[PDB]
Amino acid sequence: RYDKNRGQVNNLAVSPTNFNLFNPVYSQKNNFFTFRTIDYERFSINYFPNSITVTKEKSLGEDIDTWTNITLATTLDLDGDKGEIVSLNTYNNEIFCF
Amino acid sequence: GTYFETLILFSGNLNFSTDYPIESISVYENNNIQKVYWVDGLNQARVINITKDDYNNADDFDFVGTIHTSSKIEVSKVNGSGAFGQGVIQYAFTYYNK
Amino acid sequence: GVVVFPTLEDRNILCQGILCPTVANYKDRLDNSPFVQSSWFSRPKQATE
């Protein structure tokens, strides 16, 4: 409650316009970091043979190594009817995927 | 090494004809979802996962799914908790395999 | 520790608060126009006589 008409003996002109004003934000839960249960027998896949992740360009400044920070936010999936990604190579400024 | 491990994925009345042969595409997405799409010039296009051996009817291969059970879904309105906008609301349901 | 807190629908206790006696004008109980009505003043019980 954000009104200053609290604990005063006058209380003569108080009203719901002045007396019990309220700021709801302080009644906030720990909602930002929330979790849930998972079923062990449920089959949710974790294998992506035709998929390529891409990290951020290394800043080469005093911060984290972008290579070690993998976010899966810039993925790329090749055709799956050829086969799994056996090898990825670079030759003359161009990446070529076997 | 020396023999073909042969399995029968289905045996029934999928309407085929020798005058309308098969033309197929197959993809590898994971160790369990290995699909084979195939089409005749006469009948509907169909799908089969070759890592599954419980195909019991000819409607399990269509692009659109099939419903075997008689789903009974009743929707009732609870009052007191929630946050909605004034008006009428209608709920629709549909199965979909992952 | 990790918990699921109850919603307003599955709560056992809805709320907690004091109980205030009401008042009623003779005429108006007998005409049911107000019957019972809220008190100007909070009427607490006394612990002794």
From Swiss-Prot, chain C:
Q: Where in the cell is it found?
A: Virion
Q: List the disulfide bonds.
A: none
Give the superkingdom in one word.
Viruses
Q: How does it assemble?
A: Homohexamer.
Query: Tell me, what does this protein do in biology?
Result: Forms the muzzle assembly at the distal part of the tail. May serve as the gatekeeper to control the ejection of the cargo proteins.
Q: What name appears for this protein in its UniProt entry?
A: Muzzle protein
What's the source species for this entry?
A: Bacteroides phage crAss001
